């Protein structure tokens, strides 16, 4: 017997005490070591209800995540509201490492176990545990990284499909590496992602196919996104310390989704080094230190995909999806979907 | 919680328009714009959204390639740009926010007090 | 699109007296139904969000209800300041609307 409710949470990880790197660093002072013998309790004949698009935890871990970044990346120059703050700013070691969030006393994360779960509705397999699975908070845009996948078929998220307004969130049931590189000695900002086209392609048809069944086997069609700051109408995320931003206009080739030449092989995105960035905490701008020497270097595996429908008329030939990302909230909940808390009454 | 936006202008067919829409008493980057158009004798059309953290949006299709929504997440002030204006754009221009927040429930309120906007030669 | 479709066209009813405004949905909603408030040379006016909650500041008079596909706006006193159309809304959505006066 028990009732859903919200308390504050603690997080666990596995990160030393002696690393210079900012995940481990903060890690270290605002959570506690993991579980040595975490317990996981099946509940039979147990339907629970669960519901991603309202789950405290992602508003918990988004605080902090915020928390994370404000007291680790130190820009030159911090261009928010009218006043100008310059400090010191030296380039540090940045990696993401697993978090743990976990329940006080009193309360128990219900965990969902069913294959074909897409965020919402009950669960007929439902179990206990004290702590959720190893989360890395990996803020990028577009496109989801060193996430989890989905077991069987590939997953569409969304609270409602006619809410336009709304993120739609891809759950891959196959990772697809990324491989963006900053290649030493001359544009120095200069990068690009090497990604296997016969891999992505054949994953991204699987992901039309997927769409077609939520909306009467419709035409799909993936557009560039319209607007917006580069954060958003580019691939971004932070590697090495350094922002990349790549342009991904050929990971969403209809012609490739559609048994031709060009489509297999080495997909090369052209990506940039940028300095001068915009906050995602909506803060505002912040300028960098110029990149590091040598060779910047990060692999990563796309485990899901942002995206936005349009909204509008005249169509019923077609469907229309852009690239989405922007708020950081998103991400979280793709990985916190399957818990939710609850206080035992 | 207000949104002004800026007085009526007048324009010649196929030139151009910007309207801007100034928040006032909320925290600016927190919630999502909508905007919308009334041309007499019709009724409420949606035009767009957009997101002031990114400058996110979301176009009608009708509209993809002639509007523009931008903003100023500093002056905490959103714009519309509609490009190649015609007579049966003459109408007037809302801007509406979200009061719903992150959960993007549609819950529009406050509204601008709309900007007459009329496209005759 | 998502059909809407408001009930009567247009409604008369002496000052304190109780004014029901029915909409109807081309397609299951839930909850997700709003009411404005629109009156001429006048930005619109959230009345009613989510189907049943008021929103704040608006007098009480005003009441929301319904579900999947029928929904209802009622008030329970009417004033010649609700002299007005008014519209049932679902996103980008909006009804034909409901013009509202006193009678007399």
């Known amino acids: 017997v028990w009732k859903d409710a919200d308390t504050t949470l603690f997080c666990a990880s596995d990160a030393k005490a002696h690393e210079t790197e900012v995940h481990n660093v903060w890690a270290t002072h605002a959570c506690v070591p993991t579980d040595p013998n975490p317990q996981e309790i099946h509940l039979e004949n147990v339907t629970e209800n669960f519901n991603m698009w309202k789950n405290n935890m992602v508003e918990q871990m988004q605080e902090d995540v915020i928390s994370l970044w404000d007291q680790s990346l130190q820009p030159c120059v911090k261009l928010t509201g009218g006043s100008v703050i310059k400090q010191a700013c030296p380039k540090i070691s940045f990696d993401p490492i697993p978090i743990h969030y976990c329940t006080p006393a009193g309360y128990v994360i219900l965990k969902c176990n069913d294959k074909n779960f897409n965020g919402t509705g009950p669960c007929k397999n439902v179990s206990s545990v004290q702590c959720t699975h190893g989360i890395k908070p990996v803020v990028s845009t577009q496109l989801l990284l060193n996430g989890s996948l989905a077991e069987e078929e590939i997953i569409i998220r969304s609270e409602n499909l006619t809410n336009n307004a709304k993120t739609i969130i891809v759950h891959l049931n196959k990772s697809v590496e990324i491989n963006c590189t900053r290649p030493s000695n001359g544009d120095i900002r200069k990068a690009y992602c090497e990604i296997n086209g016969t891999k992505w392609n054949k994953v991204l048809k699987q992901v039309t196919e997927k769409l077609k069944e939520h909306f009467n086997n419709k035409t799909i069609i993936f557009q560039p996104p319209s607007g917006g700051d580069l954060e958003i109408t580019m691939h971004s995320f932070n590697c090495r310390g350094e922002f990349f931003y790549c342009n991904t206009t050929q990971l969403f080739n209809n012609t490739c989704i559609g048994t031709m030449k060009g489509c297999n092989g080495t997909i090369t995105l052209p990506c940039k080094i940028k300095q001068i960035i915009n906050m995602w905490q909506g803060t505002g701008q912040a300028m960098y230190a110029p990149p590091i020497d040598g060779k910047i270097n990060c692999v990563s595996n796309i485990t899901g995909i942002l995206l936005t429908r349009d909204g509008g008329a005249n169509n019923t030939s077609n469907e229309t999806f852009r690239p989405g990302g922007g708020n950081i909230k998103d991400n979280w909940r793709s990985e916190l979907y399957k818990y939710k808390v609850v206080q035992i009454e | 919680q207000h949104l002004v936006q800026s007085g009526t202008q007048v324009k010649k067919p196929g030139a151009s328009v910007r309207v801007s829409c100034q928040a006032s008493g909320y925290t600016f980057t927190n919630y999502i714009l909508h905007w919308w158009r009334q041309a007499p004798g019709q009724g409420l059309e949606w035009m767009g959204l957009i997101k002031p953290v990114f400058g996110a949006v979301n176009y009608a299709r009708q509209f993809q390639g002639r509007i523009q929504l931008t903003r100023d997440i500093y002056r905490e002030i959103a714009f519309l740009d509609l490009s190649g204006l015609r007579s049966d754009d003459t109408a007037v221009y809302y801007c509406?926010?979200?009061?719903?927040?992150?959960?993007?429930?549609?819950?529009?309120?406050?509204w601008g007090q709309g900007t007459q906007v009329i496209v005759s030669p | 699109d998502i059909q809407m479709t408001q009930s009567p066209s247009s409604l008369s009813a002496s000052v304190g007296d109780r004014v029901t405004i029915n909409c109807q949905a081309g397609q299951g909603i839930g909850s997700s139904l709003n009411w404005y408030q629109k009156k001429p040379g006048r930005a619109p006016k959230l009345l009613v969000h989510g189907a049943s909650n008021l929103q704040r500041g608006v007098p009480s008079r005003f009441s929301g209800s319904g579900f999947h596909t029928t929904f209802t706006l009622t008030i329970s006193s009417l004033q010649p300041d609700d002299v007005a159309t008014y519209f049932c809304?679902?996103?980008?959505?909006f009804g034909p609307g409901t013009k509202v006066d006193i009678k007399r």
């Open positions: 509406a926010r979200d009061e719903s927040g992150d959960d993007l429930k549609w819950h529009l309120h406050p």
């Open positions: 809304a679902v996103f980008q959505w």
